[PDB]
């Protein structure tokens, strides 16, 4: 099998309704105060292998 | 500060400490915490530190 083809999703603050399909693979950034106090930092790629 | 082989341990108790005022500070190279969400540390009561 794929060594890095299986991954999980690292996220929080948006607890999902049961049986919800999520495909928005967006790198987690806020661009506001609650990410190192600036925009572009804490831009963590949620998908982890 | 002391050396790595003779590190100093200091005791903190009976305090009202805010971590949000320090979380947003950018004077830190790295601040990652294990098993505890820093953002919610403002609403947690622990026995001692």
UniProtKB/Swiss-Prot annotation, chain A:
Changing residue 32 to N: In strain: 20A.EU2, Iota/B.1.526, Omicron/BA.1, Omicron/BA.2, Omicron/BA.2.12.1, Omicron/BA.2.75, Omicron/BA.4, Omicron/BA.5, Omicron/BQ.1.1, Omicron/XBB.1.5, Omicron/EG.5.1. Changing residue 7 to R: Increased resistance to neutralizing antibodies. Decreases HLA binding to NF9 epitope. Increased binding affinity to human ACE2. It comes from the Viruses. Changing residue 7 to Q: In strain: Omicron/BA.2.12.1. Changing residue 45 to S: In strain: Lambda/C.37, Omicron/BQ.1.1, Omicron/XBB.1.5, Omicron/EG.5.1. Disulfide bonds join 35-43. Residues 1-49 are annotated as: Receptor-binding motif. Changing residue 48 to Y: Reduced host ACE2-binding affinity in vitro. Changing residue 41 to V: In strain: Omicron/BA.4, Omicron/BA.5, Omicron/BQ.1.1. Residues 3-11 are annotated as: Immunodominant HLA epitope recognized by the CD8+. Residues 10-45 are annotated as: Disordered. Changing residue 8 to F: In strain: B.1.1.298. Changing residue 45 to L: Increased resistance to neutralizing antibodies and human covalescent sera neutralization. Changing residue 33 to K: In strain: Delta/B.1.617.2, Omicron/BA.1, Omicron/BA.2, Omicron/BA.2.12.1, Omicron/BA.2.75, Omicron/BA.4, Omicron/BA.5, Omicron/BQ.1.1, Omicron/XBB.1.5, Omicron/EG.5.1. Attaches the virion to the cell membrane by interacting with host receptor, initiating the infection. The major receptor is host ACE2. When S2/S2' has been cleaved, binding to the receptor triggers direct fusion at the cell membrane. When S2/S2' has not been cleaved, binding to the receptor results in internalization of the virus by endocytosis using host TFRC and GRM2 and leading to fusion of the virion membrane with the host endosomal membrane. Alternatively, may use NRP1/NRP2 and integrin as entry receptors. Binds to host ACE2. RBD also interacts with the N-linked glycan on 'Asn-90' of ACE2. Cleavage of S generates a polybasic C-terminal sequence on S1 that binds to host Neuropilin-1 (NRP1) and Neuropilin-2 (NRP2) receptors. Interacts with host integrin alpha-5/beta-1 (ITGA5:ITGB1) and with ACE2 in complex with integrin alpha-5/beta-1 (ITGA5:ITGB1). May interact via cytoplasmic c-terminus with M protein. May interact (via N-terminus) with host bilirubin and biliverdin, thereby preventing antibody binding to the SARS-CoV-2 spike NTD via an allosteric mechanism. This is Spike protein S1. The chain holds residues 446 to 494 of 1273 of the full protein.
């Amino acid at each position: 099998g794929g060594n890095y083809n299986y991954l999980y999703r690292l996220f929080r603050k948006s607890n999902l309704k049961p049986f919800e399909r999520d495909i928005s693979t967006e790198i987690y950034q806020a661009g506001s105060t609650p990410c190192n106090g600036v925009e572009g930092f804490n831009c963590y790629f949620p998908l982890q292998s | 500060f002391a050396s790595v082989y003779a590190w100093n341990r200091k005791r903190i108790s009976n305090c009202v400490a805010d971590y949000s005022v320090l979380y947003n500070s950018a004077s830190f190279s790295t601040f990652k915490c294990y098993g505890v969400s820093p953002t919610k540390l403002n609403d947690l009561c622990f026995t001692n530190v």
